Amino acid sequence: AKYTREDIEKLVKEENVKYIRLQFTDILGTIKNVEIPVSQLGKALDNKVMFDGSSIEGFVRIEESDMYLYPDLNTFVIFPWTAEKGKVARFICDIYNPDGTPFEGDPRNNLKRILKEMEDLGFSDFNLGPEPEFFLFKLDEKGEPTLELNDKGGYFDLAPTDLGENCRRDIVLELEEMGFEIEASHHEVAPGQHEIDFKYAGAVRSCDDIQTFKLVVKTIARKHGLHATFMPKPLFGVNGSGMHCNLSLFKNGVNAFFDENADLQLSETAKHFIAGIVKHATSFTAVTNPTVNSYKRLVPGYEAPCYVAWSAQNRSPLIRIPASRGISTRVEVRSVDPAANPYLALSVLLAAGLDGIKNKLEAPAPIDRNIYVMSKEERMENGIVDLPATLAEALEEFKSNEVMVKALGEHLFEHFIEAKEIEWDMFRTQVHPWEREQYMSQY
Amino acid sequence: AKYTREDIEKLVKEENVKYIRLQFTDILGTIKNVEIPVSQLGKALDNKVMFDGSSIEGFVRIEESDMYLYPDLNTFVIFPWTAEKGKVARFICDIYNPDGTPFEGDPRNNLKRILKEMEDLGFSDFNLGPEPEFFLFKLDEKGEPTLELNDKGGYFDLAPTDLGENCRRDIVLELEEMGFEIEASHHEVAPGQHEIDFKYAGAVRSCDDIQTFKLVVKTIARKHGLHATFMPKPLFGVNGSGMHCNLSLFKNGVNAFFDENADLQLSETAKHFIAGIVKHATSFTAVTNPTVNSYKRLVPGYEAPCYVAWSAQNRSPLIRIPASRGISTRVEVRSVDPAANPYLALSVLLAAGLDGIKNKLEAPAPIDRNIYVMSKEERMENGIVDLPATLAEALEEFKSNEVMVKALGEHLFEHFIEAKEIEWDMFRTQVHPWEREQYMSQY
Amino acid sequence: AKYTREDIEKLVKEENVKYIRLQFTDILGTIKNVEIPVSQLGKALDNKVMFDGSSIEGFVRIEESDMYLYPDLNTFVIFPWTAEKGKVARFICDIYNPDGTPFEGDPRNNLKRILKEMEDLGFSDFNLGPEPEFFLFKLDEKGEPTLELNDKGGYFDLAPTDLGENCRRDIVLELEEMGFEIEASHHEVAPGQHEIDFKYAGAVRSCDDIQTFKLVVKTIARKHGLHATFMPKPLFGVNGSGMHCNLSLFKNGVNAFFDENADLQLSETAKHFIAGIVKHATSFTAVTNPTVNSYKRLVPGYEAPCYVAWSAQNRSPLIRIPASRGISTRVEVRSVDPAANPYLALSVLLAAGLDGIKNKLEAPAPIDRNIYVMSKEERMENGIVDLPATLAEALEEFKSNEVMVKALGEHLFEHFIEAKEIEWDMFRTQVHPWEREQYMSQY
């Protein structure tokens, strides 16, 4: 209980807040919001503020259904950049049905349902250390984004010299005021690409920070005449952006993934986790990579996962176990990207792992080998399966997997598939310029 | 034996030919060619003219391999538009190995191998009446094609008024001089789209005319400041172009598809044919629709096949049996498109039909029903299977089918798949503008 | 020492530092870093902050590997230009392996190693007084560099008036606030060319500054709407840039090069040092001139070394010995340029010098006449050899030398050659406009 009803009231008044954003997340991971004037804070904290809950299912809405917003006193934050008379504050809310019961369609609640499922197995915490990457493009005369990158930096270079303005820098500074515990940032492989790494955090909190992060990144970027984008693969030929997820299970307050005695200092629970992730990897990809373009990133040669396998040191594995041990022992999943709905993404990732731990699934053999060279022949000769090549392919796999499906719930699942199937269909019937440049005159 | 060595020599001289085009077709259906000066006609008719035969496998060439061109005295034609001193004549050739044996890689020969397979069953002829459709676009200042259509006509309208120049009209006139037996032409559904229907003709000859047709259509069109294209789906939202194939089997010189006594006046042989086509339809689609874009046409709502079924009157069936009976009784296959390699396309279509006749496969029930409305539920409840949605999907189906695979031969098959797999892969890793307009700012 | 963890602690607290850059250097001499918030300072000073150490190898990276950063409390500096609200501080860190051992691939480490061999042979310090040269170009509308120079000044001219804006002055001023001790600065031979000479300092201090200098320069240059470049030869026909290195060996705190009563006042050790550099010059040229463009600077007629010879007065000696003596007695290597990686260039130059000292090599006769006039044949009659003409030549030469290869270490060496070999290969296969301007019509 970070803040209390009174701690919140004292703050809004002393900090002269005049605008409160009650934010939430829909089925597509998009950051939704219902804003009210400070004069309504009371009604907000009372959980009486209603809104059309059908907005949580995204562009698949069919009917208007009244619902409540239950603000989380802990998510209370104030936006520094907004200043003077008009100071804005936010509240990440939870959606409840008119009767008082939590809305199944809400993805944030889904993560809670699965976390509860975690505690029923004996685990206390499930931390997540995200590695969100993004691209910054220049803005044209008007205000529309162009294909020009904000810089020409490389992997870990000293991008935009401190003098003047430096987006990445200025973003981190804003995130600190709000209360972010950023680990560190750097310039990414491709020119104009940036990365801000978060610190360890509980599932829900960590996921809430991912949503806010994008908001702070997009806003500040626009304030510097730039355009921030978390699109997996904005440009063909250059590196794509991913959102590595460093997962870690705890029991009684201790890292349940550490074992200073077993190989790689990993415990039986850790390896079972690895197994669960490997068994469902190709099945939950539709969730960790929800967009069509998400699969243009999952192409070999750009340090992005393409096959289900884990290692401690490799070109670009699906699962990677960082050097750090002890309380830092963690399982990194590199397939996840920034376009993924954090709440849903973690739910499915938690369900996969827990499935292996609960059923004591056997973890495959590490592979410090090279998947890049060996053709599919060896990949077949070995337990190396490829990840779905298209959104369509991933959606067919997701449906078959029963634990993954039940990981999202009846309501969430139903709509997720409906939204994506339409999304895909829209893309498959589209005629791209590339098609004409290849056929228009050749045929 | 339309022409003879002497009939050819007398013609070239009297018509003052100064340039001979020895043409052939590669694996991708592209019209290849090796041109020689009239002074070499003798060496040509002697079958001594060599060329790099690796050019028949297309962009998958790996080594240079000398081969011979064996001109077909029957395919001898003279291009009317080419005039004066420089009159051009052509010769569709056959490829032979240095030793004197026919090249397996040659698609035109493949059709001959399968036609021979037809005669071994008791059939004399296998006629084909093609319905090639195309689009005409305007040319910009320079000479590059634009997205502007040559007109705004509709289905069977009186497009471009006779006065001045009218491509479609002027094309037909050129085709007649050369000796084409055109049935009739009209304006197609979509604006700027045209169709010239051929008359009944033997497989090989009919296929040879399809190749020449495209050549005459592309050339004359350019001569009118226009750009002709046989690309399946040039524009999203407008009708696509297909190449309906009206097939018909003969025995002893009579239409083996007619039976003035059985239902629909169709014979047992005709229905067996229907069965063969239905059993392999989804398997040979990769051949009758070889390009990626070929599947943007196979989308509902544009009068293009989307499900395996046959009828005599329906929205847009895969197999259609024209009204005409007697010697005109024929089985129309509407899935085939202009981008298809005629020689390969027919081979696979002949093999499918013959498979049903040889094994007396049972033909499904006609369907004057509506596939467009009934969801996949009924399509499942019925023997209604969908055609492959992507080139990839069609290529996976083609490989599994054994009769279809053996319908192309070891050498042809091997390369066809290699070329398409690469083609597809090129397309799947591409980042289309559509992707950014949908994600660039949404994420 | 210079700073204590407490000194830094107080400074960052009093100077209101908010951003901390932990910088280092990759194999290509490129300035890199990992940025962390001031709240992570403790973890930084605790040597716990990690990063992907593969970033050290540059574009030749293969697999991501965790590593630690050890901040050098003495390299702590505070960038003045950074706004009060967001003060930025830096720390040139050292790269270590997960097990607490110095990473062999770290360039700054290698220099430290070579310096140990210097201490073993009985030497106290090894000073370096670099003469960085650089050009300044104008920025177009999109902040893009142009071939337009910043002034039409000459050698030592009073380039750019004391107008409101004057990059060179403003650079030296900013460096003064950063604790940089600059000897003097002037305007170079070519228009828009500038030079800033630092006071001599230790091998590491000097290198670390060469890095910081490049950063400050480029930074302040961008603030003035200009673009700073250390590219050895930006424009054809104009002078190139070279970072002359004034080397000075110390023994027991005194100048081991000076000799009161000795020919030319150069001690024995001094002479051997000269010899050490002459036999290894052609070999270590690939390190002190790491780019393809570097060799375009190494051409006669522009005050750039083209032959291996030393002298006190000459047109363009590879090794020049300035006037001043005593503790100012030094050896200047003029072949080195600003694109070279300071740490690697100093390691190869120190190695060559120590080779000549430990093996008592005899120094050749100093060339005091014009070497430009002596034909290729003449230079052969005397001890006169040409430096590598192209990067490729320099590379093969470098591998042929053992003491030089050991100067970089197997790990550093393997990657250097890898990067440069693929680098040259790109250049070699490139087709330049020049080639087309010279063969397009002539052929």
Ligand SMILES: NC(=O)CC[C@H](N)C(=O)O
């Ligand atoms: N070094 C890296 O972590 C690169 C990650 C890369 N941007 C990706 O697509 O995952």
Ligand SMILES: NC(=O)CC[C@H](N)C(=O)O
């Ligand atoms: N009426 C028609 O035959 C239309 C055919 C349509 N152009 C197709 O794609 O097949």
Ligand SMILES: NC(=O)CC[C@H](N)C(=O)O
């Ligand atoms: N010191 C100078 O005169 C500079 C000479 C020239 N810039 C070089 O290449 O070294």
Ligand SMILES: [Mg+2]
């Ligand atoms: Mg990364």
Ligand SMILES: [Mg+2]
């Ligand atoms: Mg990572």
Ligand SMILES: [Mg+2]
């Ligand atoms: Mg038609």
Ligand SMILES: [Mg+2]
């Ligand atoms: Mg038709």
Ligand SMILES: [Mg+2]
């Ligand atoms: Mg100088």
Ligand SMILES: [Mg+2]
């Ligand atoms: Mg000098």
